[PDB]
Amino acid sequence: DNILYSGETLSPGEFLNNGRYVFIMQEDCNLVLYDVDKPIWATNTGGLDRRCHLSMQSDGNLVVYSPRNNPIWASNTGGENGNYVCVLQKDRNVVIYGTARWATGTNIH
Amino acid sequence: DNILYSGETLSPGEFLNNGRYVFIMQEDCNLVLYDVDKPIWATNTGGLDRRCHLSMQSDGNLVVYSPRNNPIWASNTGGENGNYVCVLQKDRNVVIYGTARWATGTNIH
Amino acid sequence: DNILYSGETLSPGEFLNNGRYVFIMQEDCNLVLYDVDKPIWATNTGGLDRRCHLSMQSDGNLVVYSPRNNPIWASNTGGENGNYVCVLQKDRNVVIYGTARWATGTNIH
Amino acid sequence: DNILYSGETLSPGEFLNNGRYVFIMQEDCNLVLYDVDKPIWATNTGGLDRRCHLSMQSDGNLVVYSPRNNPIWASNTGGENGNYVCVLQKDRNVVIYGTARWATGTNIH
Ligand SMILES: OC[C@H]1O[C@H](O[C@@H]2[C@H](O)[C@@H](O)O[C@H](CO)[C@H]2O)[C@@H](O)[C@@H](O)[C@@H]1O
Ligand SMILES: OC[C@H]1O[C@H](O[C@@H]2[C@H](O)[C@@H](O)O[C@H](CO)[C@H]2O)[C@@H](O)[C@@H](O)[C@@H]1O
Ligand SMILES: OC[C@H]1O[C@H](O[C@@H]2[C@H](O)[C@@H](O)O[C@H](CO)[C@H]2O)[C@@H](O)[C@@H](O)[C@@H]1O
Numbered sequence: 208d209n210i211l212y213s214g215e216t217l218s219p220g221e222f223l224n225n226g227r228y229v230f231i232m233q234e235d236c237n238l239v240l241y242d243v244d245k246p247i248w249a250t251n252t253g254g255l256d257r258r259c260h261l262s263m264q265s266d267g268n269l270v271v272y273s274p275r276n277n278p279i280w281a282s283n284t285g286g287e288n289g290n291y292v293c294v295l296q297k298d299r300n301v302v303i304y305g306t307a308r309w310a311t312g313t314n315i316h
Numbered sequence: 317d318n319i320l321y322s323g324e325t326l327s328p329g330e331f332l333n334n335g336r337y338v339f340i341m342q343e344d345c346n347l348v349l350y351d352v353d354k355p356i357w358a359t360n361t362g363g364l365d366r367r368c369h370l371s372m373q374s375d376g377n378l379v380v381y382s383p384r385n386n387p388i389w390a391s392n393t394g395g396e397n398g399n400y401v402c403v404l405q406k407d408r409n410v411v412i413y414g415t416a417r418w419a420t421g422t423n424i425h
Numbered sequence: 426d427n428i429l430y431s432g433e434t435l436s437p438g439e440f441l442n443n444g445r446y447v448f449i450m451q452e453d454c455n456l457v458l459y460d461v462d463k464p465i466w467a468t469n470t471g472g473l474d475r476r477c478h479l480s481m482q483s484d485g486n487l488v489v490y491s492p493r494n495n496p497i498w499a500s501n502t503g504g505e506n507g508n509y510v511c512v513l514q515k516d517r518n519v520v521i522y523g524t525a526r527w528a529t530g531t532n533i534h
Numbered sequence: 535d536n537i538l539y540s541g542e543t544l545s546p547g548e549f550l551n552n553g554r555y556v557f558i559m560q561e562d563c564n565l566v567l568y569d570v571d572k573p574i575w576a577t578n579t580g581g582l583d584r585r586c587h588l589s590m591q592s593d594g595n596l597v598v599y600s601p602r603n604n605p606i607w608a609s610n611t612g613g614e615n616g617n618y619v620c621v622l623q624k625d626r627n628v629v630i631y632g633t634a635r636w637a638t639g640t641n642i643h
């Protein structure tokens with residue numbers, strides 16, 4: 208998957224992928240972007256705690272939470288309630304977009 | 317591909333796909349969403365002209381243009397200049413999100 | 426997924442996909458290959474029964490079984506026991522390959 | 535792409551991908567399988583020369599050729615002429631299958 212939708216989370220070891228790029232919520236609590244074997248971006252929160260999770264929230268904020276549910280990193284983009292997306296793009300950028308401006312209304316459960 | 321980025325276009329016969337779903341700019345100028353062999357949404361512009369193209373614009377508007385570059389359908393979401401995305405989602409909805417709220421800044425050319 | 430590995434099955438409504446192509450084991454027991462909304466190949470077993478499953482076997486034979494576990498269509502490629510793959514290719518062909526000639530041996534659970 | 539078909543090649547820097555796995559023909563002539571940032575298998579031909587290419591041949595042999603078109607590594611699976619596939623699987627194994635046993639015959643240009 209290349210998208211983390213608002214209301215979804217990445218558990219320890221889970222990730223987004225796109226070609227040779229991997230965006231992973233590591234077990235050591237560091238959120239890192241890799242280009243094959245080379246790290247190119249990170250939250251620099253490795254070794255702070257064990258088994259953290261990443262959450263794309265409905266308020267638009269992207270946050271890393273500790274095992275005790277305390278934030279340890281955030282994009283600082285919390286605002287109006289709505290629908291957002293965190294995308295690992297084909298050009299190697301990781302971007303948050305929102306809110307939803309238009310839709311076909313063809314969603315299913 | 318499941319995303320049409322702002323500044324990109326779908327030429328006649330091109331499309332977005334996601335599992336069993338296909339969102340295609342048909343040669344008959346009708347933009348249609350299919351669930352395998354069943355059409356579930358369309359712009360209802362079939363037979364109006366031949367070889368139209370779809371454009372996700374930098375102003376946030378999604379537009380179908382005729383071979384003479386005249387609009388024949390639009391999402392009516394034009395506004396502030398920026399970065400947007402049109403996504404064919406895993407839940408079968410087609411949604412426009414934007415503008416960009418945050419990014420890692422790791423893009424390459 | 427674009428591959429059905431030997432030892433796996435497609436349940437009623439399940440499928441393989443690749444771009445604008447879908448290879449689906451339909452609820453009406455007909456196994457069909459679609460190019461967007463157009464059927465291009467089928468087992469022609471629609472109407473015989475409901476809820477059939479497709480199985481890529483370890484003997485190399487691809488078989489459609491009825492709800493009573495009786496075969497109603499097969500590729501007739503049964504042979505030596507081994508590892509095989511049924512692939513929905515990027516060129517629109519559906520092909521069975523095997524057995525395995527070589528491997529890195531890096532498989533994990 | 536998760537498959538390298540017979541008759542195709544991977545140029546320097548090109549690769550196969552599947553989720554968090556990448557199988558790349560590196561510019562340093564070393565063919566390596568990575569699990570995110572960790573190498574798990576390699577031809578061990580790094581440093582021998584620069585700009586080598588990987589070829590999945592119609593005789594079933596997977597070969598790494600130097601810039602002077604001399605083989606420097608091979609799977610030793612050459613045999614009858616036909617159709618084969620080198621697949622980077624979802625279970626992390628890299629495997630060669632062939633020849634083709636059956637097909638729908640729906641291939642197009
Ligand atoms: O330290 C073991 C750890 O190494 C790799 O992750 C790295 C660490 O999170 C950290 O020092 O920051 C690096 C990015 O700046 C990051 O690569 C991984 O191999 C990980 O799996 C391993 O646990
Ligand atoms: O404010 C509502 C919001 O609170 C919690 O998330 C927090 C906010 O997104 C923000 O101000 O930044 C915090 C991290 O710096 C973040 O925890 C959550 O409880 C969320 O569900 C709620 O909507
Ligand atoms: O409107 C775009 C939006 O549609 C779907 O979410 C829906 C909306 O959030 C809302 O009006 O209530 C619906 C029921 O709770 C909900 O499904 C999704 O497809 C979402 O991804 C999309 O952004």
Ligand SMILES: OC[C@H]1O[C@H](O[C@@H]2[C@H](O)[C@@H](O)O[C@H](CO)[C@H]2O)[C@@H](O)[C@@H](O)[C@@H]1O
Nearest residue numbers: 342344346348355357358362363462463
């Ligand atoms: O009319 C030929 C045309 O049929 C199918 O497209 C359909 C048309 O665009 C129209 O009548 O509206 C339908 C959705 O409401 C749509 O499916 C396709 O098979 C197309 O390829 C073909 O040219």
Ligand SMILES: OC[C@H]1O[C@H](O[C@@H]2[C@H](O)[C@@H](O)O[C@H](CO)[C@H]2O)[C@@H](O)[C@@H](O)[C@@H]1O
Nearest residue numbers: 373374375377379387389390392394395
């Ligand atoms: O307004 C600037 C914009 O103009 C043209 O696009 C138009 C607008 O997006 C909008 O008001 O709706 C029209 C269709 O109803 C659409 O054509 C383009 O020239 C675009 O590039 C430009 O930014």
Ligand SMILES: OC[C@H]1O[C@H](O[C@@H]2[C@H](O)[C@@H](O)O[C@H](CO)[C@H]2O)[C@@H](O)[C@@H](O)[C@@H]1O
Nearest residue numbers: 296298300302321399400416418419423
């Ligand atoms: O900022 C998010 C944005 O980054 C990349 O686009 C860049 C910006 O639009 C801008 O500041 O100028 C850059 C050079 O013109 C441009 O690349 C893309 O990754 C884009 O998709 C993303 O939304």
Ligand SMILES: OC[C@H]1O[C@H](O[C@@H]2[C@H](O)[C@@H](O)O[C@H](CO)[C@H]2O)[C@@H](O)[C@@H](O)[C@@H]1O
Nearest residue numbers: 353354451453455457464466467471472
């Ligand atoms: O309406 C029944 C059935 O129609 C479509 O499947 C078709 C049938 O299986 C049959 O007549 O053979 C066709 C291929 O030659 C095939 O398309 C689908 O729309 C299916 O979902 C539906 O149940």
Ligand SMILES: OC[C@H]1O[C@H](O[C@@H]2[C@H](O)[C@@H](O)O[C@H](CO)[C@H]2O)[C@@H](O)[C@@H](O)[C@@H]1O
Nearest residue numbers: 482483484486488496498499501503504
């Ligand atoms: O022969 C062992 C094999 O038997 C059953 O599969 C059958 C064979 O693959 C073949 O001769 O063709 C039959 C359909 O025409 C097919 O059922 C299964 O029981 C299988 O598990 C077993 O390996």
Ligand SMILES: OC[C@H]1O[C@H](O[C@@H]2[C@H](O)[C@@H](O)O[C@H](CO)[C@H]2O)[C@@H](O)[C@@H](O)[C@@H]1O
Nearest residue numbers: 430508509525527528532623625627629
């Ligand atoms: O050898 C290629 C083969 O490896 C894996 O399957 C394994 C073999 O079939 C065998 O030696 O026994 C193992 C345990 O039963 C089995 O995992 C898979 O990666 C398979 O896809 C591949 O063809």
Ligand SMILES: OC[C@H]1O[C@H](O[C@@H]2[C@H](O)[C@@H](O)O[C@H](CO)[C@H]2O)[C@@H](O)[C@@H](O)[C@@H]1O
Nearest residue numbers: 244245560562564566573575576580581
């Ligand atoms: O720095 C050179 C080279 O390092 C990495 O590739 C490694 C080498 O090919 C070699 O020492 O063998 C390793 C596998 O056993 C392999 O990882 C990559 O970072 C590569 O891009 C780089 O050129």
Ligand SMILES: OC[C@H]1O[C@H](O[C@@H]2[C@H](O)[C@@H](O)O[C@H](CO)[C@H]2O)[C@@H](O)[C@@H](O)[C@@H]1O
Nearest residue numbers: 591592593595597605607608610612613
């Ligand atoms: O034998 C015909 C074959 O020759 C060359 O490939 C070689 C063979 O696949 C094999 O015996 O092993 C060699 C590496 O050890 C390999 O080069 C090619 O010229 C090929 O095109 C041809 O089919």
Ligand SMILES: OC[C@H]1O[C@H](O[C@@H]2[C@H](O)[C@@H](O)O[C@H](CO)[C@H]2O)[C@@H](O)[C@@H](O)[C@@H]1O
Nearest residue numbers: 514516518520539617618634636637641
């Ligand atoms: O038969 C399976 C095979 O079909 C297609 O390749 C074709 C055959 O190799 C052959 O009969 O000649 C054709 C023209 O040279 C060739 O296209 C492909 O779909 C291939 O991937 C597949 O294995």
